[PDB]
Design a binder for this molecule. Sequence first.
Ligand SMILES: CC(C)(C)c1cc(-c2ccc(S(=O)(=O)CCO)cc2)cc([C@@H]2C[C@@H]2c2ccccn2)c1
Length: 228
Amino acid sequence: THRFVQKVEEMVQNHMTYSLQDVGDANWQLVVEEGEMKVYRREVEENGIVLDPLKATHAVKGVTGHEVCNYFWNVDVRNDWETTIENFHVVETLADNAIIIYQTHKRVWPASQRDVLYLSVIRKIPALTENDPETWIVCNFSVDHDSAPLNNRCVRAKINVAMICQTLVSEISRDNILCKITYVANVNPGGWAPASVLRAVAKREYPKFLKRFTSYVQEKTAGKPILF
Ligand SMILES: CC(C)(C)c1cc(-c2ccc(S(=O)(=O)CCO)cc2)cc([C@@H]2C[C@@H]2c2ccccn2)c1
């Protein structure tokens, strides 16, 4: 019971209430569709800066949500799949399922480099009823911290990202399992950046990040006991 338990609970529950809802919803603009993966955005600017909420859904054969979330959360494999960061440092271990991370992102010309400081928590949400599936969720959201590094080259972004996973099973085989992912990211670039750049990056890099990440999960897990 670290100092962030109540805030974690609130971020997680807002995701379970809002992020999981189907989008039908003309609010969401469907931007990219490649097979199982659908990527939506809303066009939002605050103080002239692009904030466009991003939401993707995906269906990945042969993995569970527990697996997907472990791989997304576990800093030990962070460097194998991650293509967006130059460095990260674990600032603080809060619990066996919660840490605070500092990371610097690769520069995207011509915007300044960004850094981010966030709490990352992995959580299992038991089936609400015996009909409903259980859910595994990772939430990454920005927090303040006294041991925040000094990085004069970087503008501080703020993020609220969730990777939310439900598992369908049709002796259980990988052939028989399907992980349904909803992934959401609300990123505040934290100072001026060209609108066109942020939008092209999002539109090109989110589908790649997600197909790449999930392909890595399928690969790391294939022919290994199923961790439900
Ligand atoms: C533009 C866009 C795609 C919405 C964006 C997305 C991310 C982002 C953040 C976190 C995650 S994660 O899923 O929590 C995995 C651990 O990192 C994935 C992606 C970061 C930026 C950084 C703000 C900085 C930035 C600023 C200017 C140009 C390029 N990049 C911009």
